[PDB]
Short mmCIF file of C-alpha atoms and ligand atoms in Angstrom, two decimals:
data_model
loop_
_atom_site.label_atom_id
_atom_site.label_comp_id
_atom_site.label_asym_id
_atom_site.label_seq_id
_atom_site.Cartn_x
_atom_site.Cartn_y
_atom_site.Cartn_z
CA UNK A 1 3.47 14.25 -38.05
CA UNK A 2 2.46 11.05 -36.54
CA UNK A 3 1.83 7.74 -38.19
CA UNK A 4 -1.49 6.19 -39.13
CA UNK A 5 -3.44 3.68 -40.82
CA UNK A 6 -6.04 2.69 -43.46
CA UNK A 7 -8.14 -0.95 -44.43
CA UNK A 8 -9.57 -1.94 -47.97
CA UNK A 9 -11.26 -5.26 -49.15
CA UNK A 10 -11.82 -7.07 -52.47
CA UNK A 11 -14.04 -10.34 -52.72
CA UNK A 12 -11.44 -12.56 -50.77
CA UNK A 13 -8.87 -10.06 -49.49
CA UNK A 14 -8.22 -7.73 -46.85
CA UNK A 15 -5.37 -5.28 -46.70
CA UNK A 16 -4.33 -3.11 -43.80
CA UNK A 17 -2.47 -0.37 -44.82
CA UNK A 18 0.16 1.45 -41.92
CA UNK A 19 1.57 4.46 -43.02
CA UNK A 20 4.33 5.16 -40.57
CA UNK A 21 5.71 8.56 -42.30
CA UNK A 22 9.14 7.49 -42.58
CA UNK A 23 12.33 7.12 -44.64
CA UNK A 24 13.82 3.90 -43.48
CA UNK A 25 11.08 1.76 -43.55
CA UNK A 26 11.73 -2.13 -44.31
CA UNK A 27 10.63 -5.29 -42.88
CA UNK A 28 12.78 -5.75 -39.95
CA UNK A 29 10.21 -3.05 -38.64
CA UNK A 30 7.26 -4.67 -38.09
CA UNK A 31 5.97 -7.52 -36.78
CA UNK A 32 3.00 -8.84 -37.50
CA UNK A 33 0.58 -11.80 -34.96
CA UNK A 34 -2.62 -13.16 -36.16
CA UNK A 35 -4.86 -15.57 -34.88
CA UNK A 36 -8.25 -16.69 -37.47
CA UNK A 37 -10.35 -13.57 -35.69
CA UNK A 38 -7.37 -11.03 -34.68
CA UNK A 39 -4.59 -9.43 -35.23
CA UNK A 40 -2.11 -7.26 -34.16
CA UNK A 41 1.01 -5.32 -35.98
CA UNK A 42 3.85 -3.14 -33.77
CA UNK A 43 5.62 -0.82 -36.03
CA UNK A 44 9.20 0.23 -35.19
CA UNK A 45 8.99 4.08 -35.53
CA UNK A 46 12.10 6.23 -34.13
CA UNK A 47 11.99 5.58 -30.53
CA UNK A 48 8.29 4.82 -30.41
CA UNK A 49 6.33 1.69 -31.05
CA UNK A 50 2.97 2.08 -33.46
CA UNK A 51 0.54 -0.65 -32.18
CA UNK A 52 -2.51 -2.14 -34.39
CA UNK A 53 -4.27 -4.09 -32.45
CA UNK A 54 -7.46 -5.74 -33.90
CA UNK A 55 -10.50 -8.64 -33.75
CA UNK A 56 -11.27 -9.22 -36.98
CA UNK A 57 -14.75 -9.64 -38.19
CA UNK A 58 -14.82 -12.69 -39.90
CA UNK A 59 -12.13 -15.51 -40.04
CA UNK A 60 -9.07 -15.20 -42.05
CA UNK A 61 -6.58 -18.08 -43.27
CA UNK A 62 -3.33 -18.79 -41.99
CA UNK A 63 -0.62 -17.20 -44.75
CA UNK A 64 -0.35 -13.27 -45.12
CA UNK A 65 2.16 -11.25 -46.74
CA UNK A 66 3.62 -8.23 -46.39
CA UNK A 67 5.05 -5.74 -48.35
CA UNK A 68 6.63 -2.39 -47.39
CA UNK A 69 6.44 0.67 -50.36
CA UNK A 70 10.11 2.59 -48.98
CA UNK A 71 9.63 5.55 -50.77
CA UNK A 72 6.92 6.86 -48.25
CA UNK A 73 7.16 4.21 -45.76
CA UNK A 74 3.91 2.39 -46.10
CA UNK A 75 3.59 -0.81 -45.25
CA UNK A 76 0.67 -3.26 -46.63
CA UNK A 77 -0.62 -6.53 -44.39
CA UNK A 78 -3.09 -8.65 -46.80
CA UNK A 79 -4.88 -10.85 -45.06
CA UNK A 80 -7.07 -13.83 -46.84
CA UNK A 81 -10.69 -14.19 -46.02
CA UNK A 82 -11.57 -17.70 -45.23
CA UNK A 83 -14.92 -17.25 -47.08
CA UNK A 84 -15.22 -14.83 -50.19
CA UNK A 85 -17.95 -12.20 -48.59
CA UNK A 86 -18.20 -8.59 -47.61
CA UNK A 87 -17.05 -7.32 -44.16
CA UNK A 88 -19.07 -4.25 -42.95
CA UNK A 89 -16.31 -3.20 -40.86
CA UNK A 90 -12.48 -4.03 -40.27
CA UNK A 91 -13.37 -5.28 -36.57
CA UNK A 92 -13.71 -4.36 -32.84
CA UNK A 93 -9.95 -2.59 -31.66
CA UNK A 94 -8.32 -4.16 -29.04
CA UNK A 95 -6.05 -3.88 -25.89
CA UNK A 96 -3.51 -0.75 -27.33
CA UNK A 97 -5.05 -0.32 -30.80
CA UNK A 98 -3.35 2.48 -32.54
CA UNK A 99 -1.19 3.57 -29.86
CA UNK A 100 2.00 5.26 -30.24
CA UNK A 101 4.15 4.59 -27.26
CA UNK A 102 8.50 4.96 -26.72
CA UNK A 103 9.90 1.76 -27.10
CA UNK A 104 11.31 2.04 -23.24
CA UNK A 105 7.79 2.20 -22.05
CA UNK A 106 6.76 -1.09 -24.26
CA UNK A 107 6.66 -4.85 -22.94
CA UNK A 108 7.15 -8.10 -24.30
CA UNK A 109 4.76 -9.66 -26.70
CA UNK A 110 5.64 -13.54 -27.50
CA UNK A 111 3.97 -16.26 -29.75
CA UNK A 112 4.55 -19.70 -29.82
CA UNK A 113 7.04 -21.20 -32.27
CA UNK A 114 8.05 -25.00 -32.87
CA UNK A 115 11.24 -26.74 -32.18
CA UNK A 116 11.98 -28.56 -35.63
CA UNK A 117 15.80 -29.80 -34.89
CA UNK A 118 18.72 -29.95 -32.46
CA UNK A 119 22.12 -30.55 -33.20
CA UNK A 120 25.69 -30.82 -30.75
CA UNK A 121 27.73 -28.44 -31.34
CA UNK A 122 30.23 -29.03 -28.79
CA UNK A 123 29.78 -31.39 -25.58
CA UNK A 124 27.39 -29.09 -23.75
CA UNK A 125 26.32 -26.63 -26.63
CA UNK A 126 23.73 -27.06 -29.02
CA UNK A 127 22.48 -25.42 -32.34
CA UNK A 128 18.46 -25.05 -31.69
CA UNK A 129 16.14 -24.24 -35.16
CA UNK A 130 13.06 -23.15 -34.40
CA UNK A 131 9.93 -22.25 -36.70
CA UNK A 132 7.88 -19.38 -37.04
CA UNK A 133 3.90 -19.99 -37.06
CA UNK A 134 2.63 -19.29 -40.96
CA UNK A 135 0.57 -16.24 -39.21
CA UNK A 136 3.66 -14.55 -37.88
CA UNK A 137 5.98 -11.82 -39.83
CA UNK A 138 9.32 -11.55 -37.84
CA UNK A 139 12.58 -10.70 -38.17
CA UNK A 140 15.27 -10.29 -35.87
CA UNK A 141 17.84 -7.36 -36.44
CA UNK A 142 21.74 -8.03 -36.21
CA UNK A 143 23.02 -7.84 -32.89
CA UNK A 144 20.04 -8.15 -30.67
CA UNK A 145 18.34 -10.94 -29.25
CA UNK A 146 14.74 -12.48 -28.06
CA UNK A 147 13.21 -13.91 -25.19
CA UNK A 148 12.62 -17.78 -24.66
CA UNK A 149 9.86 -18.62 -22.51
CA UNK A 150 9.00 -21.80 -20.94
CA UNK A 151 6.37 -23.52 -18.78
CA UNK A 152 7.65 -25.20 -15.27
CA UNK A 153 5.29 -25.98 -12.13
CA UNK A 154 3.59 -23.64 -11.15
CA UNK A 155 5.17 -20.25 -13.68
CA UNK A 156 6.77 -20.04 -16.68
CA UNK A 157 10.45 -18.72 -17.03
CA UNK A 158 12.39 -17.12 -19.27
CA UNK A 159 15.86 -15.90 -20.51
CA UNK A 160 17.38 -14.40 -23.63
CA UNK A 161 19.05 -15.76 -26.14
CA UNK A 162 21.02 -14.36 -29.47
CA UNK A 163 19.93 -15.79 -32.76
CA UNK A 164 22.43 -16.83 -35.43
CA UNK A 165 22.81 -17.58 -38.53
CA UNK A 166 22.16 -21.45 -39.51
CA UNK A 167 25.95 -21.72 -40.65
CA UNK A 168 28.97 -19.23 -41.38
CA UNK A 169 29.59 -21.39 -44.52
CA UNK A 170 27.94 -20.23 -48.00
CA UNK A 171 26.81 -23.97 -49.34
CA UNK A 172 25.07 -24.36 -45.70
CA UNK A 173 23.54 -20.36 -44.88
CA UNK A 174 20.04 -19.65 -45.88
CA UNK A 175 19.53 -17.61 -49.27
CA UNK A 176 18.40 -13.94 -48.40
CA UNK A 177 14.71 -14.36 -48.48
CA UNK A 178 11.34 -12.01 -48.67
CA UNK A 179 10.54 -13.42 -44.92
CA UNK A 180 12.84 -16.20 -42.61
CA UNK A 181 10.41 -18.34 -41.20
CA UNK A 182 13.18 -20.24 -39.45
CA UNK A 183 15.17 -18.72 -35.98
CA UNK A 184 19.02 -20.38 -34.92
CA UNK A 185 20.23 -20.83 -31.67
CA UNK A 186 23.18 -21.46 -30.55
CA UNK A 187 22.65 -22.43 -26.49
CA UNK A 188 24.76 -23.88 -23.98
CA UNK A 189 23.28 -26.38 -21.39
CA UNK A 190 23.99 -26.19 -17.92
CA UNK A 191 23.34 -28.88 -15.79
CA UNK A 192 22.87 -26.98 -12.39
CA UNK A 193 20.87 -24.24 -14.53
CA UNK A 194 17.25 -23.24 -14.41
CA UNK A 195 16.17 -22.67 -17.75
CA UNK A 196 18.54 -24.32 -20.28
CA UNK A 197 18.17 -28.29 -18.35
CA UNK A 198 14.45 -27.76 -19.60
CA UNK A 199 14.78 -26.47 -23.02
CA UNK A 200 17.22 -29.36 -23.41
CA UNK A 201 14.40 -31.67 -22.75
CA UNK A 202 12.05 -30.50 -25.20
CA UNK A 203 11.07 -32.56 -28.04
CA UNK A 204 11.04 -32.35 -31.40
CA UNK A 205 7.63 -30.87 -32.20
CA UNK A 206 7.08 -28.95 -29.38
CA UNK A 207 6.91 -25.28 -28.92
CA UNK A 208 8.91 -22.55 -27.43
CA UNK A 209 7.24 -19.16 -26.88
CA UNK A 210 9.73 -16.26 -28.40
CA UNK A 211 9.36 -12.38 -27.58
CA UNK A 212 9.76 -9.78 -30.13
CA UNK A 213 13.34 -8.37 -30.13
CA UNK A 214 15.42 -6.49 -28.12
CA UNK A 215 18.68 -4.46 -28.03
CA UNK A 216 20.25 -0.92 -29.09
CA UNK A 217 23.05 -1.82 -31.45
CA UNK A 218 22.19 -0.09 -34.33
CA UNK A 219 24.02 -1.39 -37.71
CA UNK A 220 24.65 1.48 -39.08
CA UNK A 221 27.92 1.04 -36.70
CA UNK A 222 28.62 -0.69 -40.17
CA UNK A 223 28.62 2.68 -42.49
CA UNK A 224 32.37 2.60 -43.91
CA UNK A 225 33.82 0.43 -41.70
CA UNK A 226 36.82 -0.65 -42.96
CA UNK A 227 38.57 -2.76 -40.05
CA UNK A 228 36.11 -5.34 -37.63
CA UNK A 229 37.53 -6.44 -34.64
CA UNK A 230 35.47 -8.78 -32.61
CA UNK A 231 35.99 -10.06 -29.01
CA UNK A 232 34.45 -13.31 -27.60
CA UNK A 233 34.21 -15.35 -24.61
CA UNK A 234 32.22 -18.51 -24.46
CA UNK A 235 28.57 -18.36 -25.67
CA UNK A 236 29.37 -14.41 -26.02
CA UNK A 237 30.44 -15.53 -29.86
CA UNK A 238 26.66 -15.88 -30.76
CA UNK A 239 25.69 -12.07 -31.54
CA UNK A 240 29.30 -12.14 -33.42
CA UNK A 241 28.20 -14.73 -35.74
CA UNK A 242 25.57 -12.50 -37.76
CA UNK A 243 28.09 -9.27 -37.44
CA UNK A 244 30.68 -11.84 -39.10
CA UNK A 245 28.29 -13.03 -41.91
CA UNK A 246 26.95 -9.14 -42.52
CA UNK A 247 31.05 -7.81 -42.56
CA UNK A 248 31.79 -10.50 -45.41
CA UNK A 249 28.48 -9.77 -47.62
CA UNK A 250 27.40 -6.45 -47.19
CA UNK A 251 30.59 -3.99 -46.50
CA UNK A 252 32.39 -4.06 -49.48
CA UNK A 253 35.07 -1.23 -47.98
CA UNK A 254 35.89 -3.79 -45.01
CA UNK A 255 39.43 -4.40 -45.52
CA UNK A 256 39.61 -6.75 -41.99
CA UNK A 257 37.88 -8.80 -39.76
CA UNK A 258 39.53 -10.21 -36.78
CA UNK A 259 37.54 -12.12 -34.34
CA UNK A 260 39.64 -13.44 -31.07
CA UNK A 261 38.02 -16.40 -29.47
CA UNK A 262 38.10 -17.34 -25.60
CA UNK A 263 37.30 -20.68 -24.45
CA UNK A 264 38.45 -23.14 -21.74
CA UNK A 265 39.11 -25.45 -23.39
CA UNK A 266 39.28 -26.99 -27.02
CA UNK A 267 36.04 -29.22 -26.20
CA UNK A 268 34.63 -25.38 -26.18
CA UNK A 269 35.63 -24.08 -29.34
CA UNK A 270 31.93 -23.70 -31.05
CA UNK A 271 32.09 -23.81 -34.77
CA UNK A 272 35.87 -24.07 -35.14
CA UNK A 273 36.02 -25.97 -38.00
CA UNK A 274 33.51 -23.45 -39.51
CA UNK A 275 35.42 -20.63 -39.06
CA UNK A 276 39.39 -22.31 -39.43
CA UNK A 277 37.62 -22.97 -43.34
CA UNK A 278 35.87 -19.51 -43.75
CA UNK A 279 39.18 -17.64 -42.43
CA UNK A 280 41.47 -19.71 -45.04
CA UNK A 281 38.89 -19.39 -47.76
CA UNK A 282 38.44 -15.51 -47.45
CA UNK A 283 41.88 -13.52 -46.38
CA UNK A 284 39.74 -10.76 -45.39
CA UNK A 285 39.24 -12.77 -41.93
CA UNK A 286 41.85 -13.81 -39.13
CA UNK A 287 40.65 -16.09 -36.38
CA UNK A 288 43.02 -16.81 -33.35
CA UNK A 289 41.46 -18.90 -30.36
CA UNK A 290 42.87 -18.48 -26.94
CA UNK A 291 42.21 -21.37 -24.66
CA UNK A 292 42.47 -20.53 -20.88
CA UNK A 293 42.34 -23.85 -19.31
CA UNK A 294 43.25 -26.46 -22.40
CA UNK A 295 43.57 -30.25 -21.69
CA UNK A 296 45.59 -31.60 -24.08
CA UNK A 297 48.89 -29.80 -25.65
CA UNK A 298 47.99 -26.75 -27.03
CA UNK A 299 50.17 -24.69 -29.49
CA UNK A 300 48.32 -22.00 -29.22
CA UNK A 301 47.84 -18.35 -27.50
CA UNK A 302 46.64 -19.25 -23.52
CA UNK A 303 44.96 -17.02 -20.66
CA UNK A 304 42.18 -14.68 -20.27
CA UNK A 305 42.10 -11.60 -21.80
CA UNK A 306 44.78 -9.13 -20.88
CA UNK A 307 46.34 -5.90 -21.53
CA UNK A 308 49.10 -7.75 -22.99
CA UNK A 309 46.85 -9.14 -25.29
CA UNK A 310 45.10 -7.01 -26.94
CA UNK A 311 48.14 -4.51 -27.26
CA UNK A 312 49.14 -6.90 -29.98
CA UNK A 313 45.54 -7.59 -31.49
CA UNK A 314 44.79 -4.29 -31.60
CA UNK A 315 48.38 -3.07 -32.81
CA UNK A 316 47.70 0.27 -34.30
CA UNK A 317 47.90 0.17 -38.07
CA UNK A 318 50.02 2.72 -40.12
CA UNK A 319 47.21 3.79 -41.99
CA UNK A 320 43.92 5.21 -40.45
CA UNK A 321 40.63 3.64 -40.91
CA UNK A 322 37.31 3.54 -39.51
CA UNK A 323 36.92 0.51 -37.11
CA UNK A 324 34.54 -0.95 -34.39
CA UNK A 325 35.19 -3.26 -31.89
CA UNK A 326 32.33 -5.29 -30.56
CA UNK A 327 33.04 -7.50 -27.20
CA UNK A 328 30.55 -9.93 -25.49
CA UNK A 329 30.81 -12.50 -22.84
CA UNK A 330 31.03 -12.92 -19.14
CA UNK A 331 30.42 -9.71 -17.17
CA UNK A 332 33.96 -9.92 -16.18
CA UNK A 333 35.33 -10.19 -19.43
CA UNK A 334 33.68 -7.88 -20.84
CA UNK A 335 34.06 -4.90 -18.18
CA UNK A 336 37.73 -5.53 -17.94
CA UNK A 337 37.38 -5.74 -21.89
CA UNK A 338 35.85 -2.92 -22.13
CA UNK A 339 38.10 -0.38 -19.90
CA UNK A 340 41.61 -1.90 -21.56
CA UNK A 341 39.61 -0.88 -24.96
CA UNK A 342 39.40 2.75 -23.19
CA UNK A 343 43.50 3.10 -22.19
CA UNK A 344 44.39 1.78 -25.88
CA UNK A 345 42.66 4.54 -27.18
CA UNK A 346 39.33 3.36 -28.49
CA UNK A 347 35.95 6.23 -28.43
CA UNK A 348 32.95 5.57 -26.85
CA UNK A 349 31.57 5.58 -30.72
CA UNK A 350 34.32 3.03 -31.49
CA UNK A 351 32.89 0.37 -29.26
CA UNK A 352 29.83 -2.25 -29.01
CA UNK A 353 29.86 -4.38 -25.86
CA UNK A 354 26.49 -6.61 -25.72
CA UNK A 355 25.15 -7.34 -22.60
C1 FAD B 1 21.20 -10.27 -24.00
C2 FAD B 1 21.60 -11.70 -23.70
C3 FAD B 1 21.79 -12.59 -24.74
C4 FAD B 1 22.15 -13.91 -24.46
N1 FAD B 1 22.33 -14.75 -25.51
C5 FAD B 1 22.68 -16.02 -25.26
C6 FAD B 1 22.90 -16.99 -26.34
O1 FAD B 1 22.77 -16.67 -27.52
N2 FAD B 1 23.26 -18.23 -26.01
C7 FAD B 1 23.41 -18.64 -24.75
O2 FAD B 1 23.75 -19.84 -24.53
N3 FAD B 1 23.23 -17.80 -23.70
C8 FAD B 1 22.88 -16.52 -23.88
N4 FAD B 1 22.71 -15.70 -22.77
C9 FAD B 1 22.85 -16.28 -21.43
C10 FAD B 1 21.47 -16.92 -21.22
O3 FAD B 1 20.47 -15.92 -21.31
C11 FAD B 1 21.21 -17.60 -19.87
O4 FAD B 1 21.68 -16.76 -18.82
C12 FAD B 1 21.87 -18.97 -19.85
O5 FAD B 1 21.21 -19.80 -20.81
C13 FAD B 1 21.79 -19.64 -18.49
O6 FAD B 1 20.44 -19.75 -18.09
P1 FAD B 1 20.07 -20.95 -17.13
O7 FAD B 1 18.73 -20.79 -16.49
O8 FAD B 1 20.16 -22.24 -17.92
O9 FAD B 1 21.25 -21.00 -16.03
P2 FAD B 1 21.29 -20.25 -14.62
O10 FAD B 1 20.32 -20.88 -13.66
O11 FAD B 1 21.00 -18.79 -14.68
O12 FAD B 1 22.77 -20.50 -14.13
C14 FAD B 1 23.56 -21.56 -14.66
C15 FAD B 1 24.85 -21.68 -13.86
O13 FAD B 1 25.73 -20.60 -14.16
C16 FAD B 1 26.33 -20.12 -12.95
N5 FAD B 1 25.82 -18.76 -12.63
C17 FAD B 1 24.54 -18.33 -12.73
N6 FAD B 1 24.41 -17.04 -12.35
C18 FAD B 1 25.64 -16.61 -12.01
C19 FAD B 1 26.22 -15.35 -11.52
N7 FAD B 1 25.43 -14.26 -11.34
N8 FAD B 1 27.54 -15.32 -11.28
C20 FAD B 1 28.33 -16.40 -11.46
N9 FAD B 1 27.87 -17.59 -11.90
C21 FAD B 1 26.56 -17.75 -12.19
C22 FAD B 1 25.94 -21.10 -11.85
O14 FAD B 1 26.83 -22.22 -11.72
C23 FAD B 1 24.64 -21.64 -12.35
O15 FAD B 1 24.42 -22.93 -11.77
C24 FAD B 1 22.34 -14.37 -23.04
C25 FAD B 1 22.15 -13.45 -22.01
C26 FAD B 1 21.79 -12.14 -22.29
C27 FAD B 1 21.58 -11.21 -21.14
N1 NAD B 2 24.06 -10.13 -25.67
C1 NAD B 2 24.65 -10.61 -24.58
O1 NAD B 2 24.78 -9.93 -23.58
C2 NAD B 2 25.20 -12.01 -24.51
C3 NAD B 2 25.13 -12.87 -25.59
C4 NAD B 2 25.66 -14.14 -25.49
C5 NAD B 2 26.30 -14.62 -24.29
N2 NAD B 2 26.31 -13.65 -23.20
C6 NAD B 2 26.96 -14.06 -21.95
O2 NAD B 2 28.23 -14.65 -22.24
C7 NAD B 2 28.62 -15.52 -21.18
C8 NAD B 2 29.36 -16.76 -21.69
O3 NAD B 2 29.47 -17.72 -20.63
P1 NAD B 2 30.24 -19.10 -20.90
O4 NAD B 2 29.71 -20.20 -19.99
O5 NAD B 2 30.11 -19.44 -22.36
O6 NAD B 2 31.79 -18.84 -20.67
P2 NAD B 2 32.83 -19.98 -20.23
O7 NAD B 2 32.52 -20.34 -18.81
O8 NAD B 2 32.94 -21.15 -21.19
O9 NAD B 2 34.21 -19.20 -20.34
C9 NAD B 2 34.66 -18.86 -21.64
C10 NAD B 2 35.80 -17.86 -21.52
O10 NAD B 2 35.38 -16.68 -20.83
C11 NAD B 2 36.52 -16.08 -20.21
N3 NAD B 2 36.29 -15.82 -18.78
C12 NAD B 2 35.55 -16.55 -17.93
N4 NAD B 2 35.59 -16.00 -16.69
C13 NAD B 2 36.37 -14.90 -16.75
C14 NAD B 2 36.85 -13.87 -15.82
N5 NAD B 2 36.49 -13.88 -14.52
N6 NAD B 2 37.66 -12.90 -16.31
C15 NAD B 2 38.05 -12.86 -17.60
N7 NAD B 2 37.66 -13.77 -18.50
C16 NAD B 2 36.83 -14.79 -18.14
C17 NAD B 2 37.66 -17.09 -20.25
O11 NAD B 2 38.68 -16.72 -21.19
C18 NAD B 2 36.97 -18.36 -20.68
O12 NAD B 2 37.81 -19.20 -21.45
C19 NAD B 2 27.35 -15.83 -20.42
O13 NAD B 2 27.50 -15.29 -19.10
C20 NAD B 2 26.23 -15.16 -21.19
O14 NAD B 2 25.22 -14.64 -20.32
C21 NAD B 2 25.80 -12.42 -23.33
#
């Protein structure tokens, strides 16, 4: 029962038509590039990617839509002719055109998007908003990330990064809308680095080339849950900040969210003020920081993380409840995380780390 596709035209329009054959289908699963004469459309289905891949006759305009019909998991791309005329055919198929391929066996596509502001954060961490093109449908699921990609002498480089949300705080986070045209960073710059020294020199205006995304953690984790704990070190906070926006909006059996917080040192707390006002507006959230190297006096918890730690994070409640724990950071931190999480008791199927 494999997925196909269809085209249909009216005096300015022209609508492809994917018909994946599944339950499930919304628009976090495909993502849709177009140039004025092509066009291409990957289709998350199961395991396997569905690829359109297509020159276009004659020119089309800029804005699309999209729309996805649930019930039988259709999903409609209208295009907009540039001139109001008949096509005599859809166009010529290109590199992969309706292939159906596992997802393992798939590389990265990118398009270019546009750095539109920068803002500090801390001292050597920035928030980075970057733009979708008007001819690009993308979203990026919860808890995965994308690809930056960069031109240097001689080869272009690249790394991953997690997007965010804008902000954790309702009067600053973007309304849900039909399509996010706008991607959040949250990136820390390291002088003796490779890649971040040069997307810290980027202006305003200039563009970034971003892969399509990447990463296994499937949100149905989120079915039920009734107690969050999350674990992060550093710039490991970032995939916690969607997970943190999606446990106070859309699980209305979560009881608790916990997040514990490692930095060095205060300088390195990103978004504190964000989340000390979110935790005391919303009791549903605790937030404890642990600094492992602070400066100035510090009243706080101190260290790295420990067994002793997390004995008392984690204290077992007297009431059972279904809970996930999601850790990210350093490879250290979150290996040794990761097997304390095993001797306190915690499945396989209780556990996210990202990495
Ligand atoms: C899935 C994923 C998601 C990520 N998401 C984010 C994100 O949202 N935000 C974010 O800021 N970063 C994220 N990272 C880290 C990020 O991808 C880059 O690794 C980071 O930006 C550094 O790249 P760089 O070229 O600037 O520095 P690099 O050149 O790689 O190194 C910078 C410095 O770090 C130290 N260092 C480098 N490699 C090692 C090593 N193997 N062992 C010990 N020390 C080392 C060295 O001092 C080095 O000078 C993510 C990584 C992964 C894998
Ligand atoms: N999806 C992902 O895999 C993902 C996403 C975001 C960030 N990351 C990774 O998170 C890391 C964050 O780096 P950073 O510069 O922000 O951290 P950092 O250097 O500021 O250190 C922050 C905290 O990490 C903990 N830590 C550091 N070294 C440790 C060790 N050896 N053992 C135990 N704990 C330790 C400490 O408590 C420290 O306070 C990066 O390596 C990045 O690649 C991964």
């Amino acid at each position: 029962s494999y997925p196909s596709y269809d085209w249909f035209q009216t005096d300015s329009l022209v609508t492809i038509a994917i018909y994946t054959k599944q339950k499930d289908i919304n628009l976090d699963s495909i993502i849709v590039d177009h140039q004025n004469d092509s066009f291409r459309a990957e289709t998350i289905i199961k395991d396997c990617l569905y690829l359109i891949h297509i020159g276009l006759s004659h020119e089309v305009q800029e804005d699309f839509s999209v729309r996805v019909v649930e019930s039988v998991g259709k999903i409609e791309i209208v295009l907009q002719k540039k001139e109001n005329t008949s096509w005599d055919f859809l166009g010529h198929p290109l590199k992969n055109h309706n292939s159906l391929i596992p997802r393992k066996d798939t590389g990265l596509y990118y398009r270019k998007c546009q750095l539109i502001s920068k803002e500090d954060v801390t001292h050597d961490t920035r928030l980075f908003c970057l733009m979708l093109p008007p001819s690009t449908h993308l979203q990026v699921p919860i808890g995965q990330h994308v690809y930056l990609k960069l031109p240097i002498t001689g080869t272009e480089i690249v790394k991953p990064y997690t997007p965010v949300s804008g902000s954790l705080l309702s009067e600053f986070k973007e309304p849900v809308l039909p399509n996010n045209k706008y991607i959040y960073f949250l990136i820390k710059i390291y002088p003796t680095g490779l890649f971040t020294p040069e997307l810290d020199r980027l202006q305003i205006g200039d563009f970034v080339s971003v892969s399509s995304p990447e990463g296994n953690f499937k949100i149905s984790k989120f079915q039920e849950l009734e107690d969050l704990f999350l674990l992060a070190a550093g710039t490991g906070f970032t995939p916690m900040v969607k997970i943190l926006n999606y446990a106070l909006t859309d699980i209305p059996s979560l009881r608790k969210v916990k997040l514990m917080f490692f930095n060095k040192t205060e300088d390195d707390i990103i978004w504190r003020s964000q989340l000390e006002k979110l935790a005391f507006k919303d009791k549903r959230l605790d937030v404890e920081f642990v600094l492992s190297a602070p400066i100035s006096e510090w009243n706080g918890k101190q260290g790295h993380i420990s067994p002793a730690l997390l004995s008392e994070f984690l204290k077992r409640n007297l009431d059972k409840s279904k809970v996930l724990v999601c850790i990210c950071g350093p490879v250290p931190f979150t290996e040794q995380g990761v097997r304390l999480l095993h001797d306190l008791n915690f499945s396989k199927n209780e556990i996210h780390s990202f990495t």
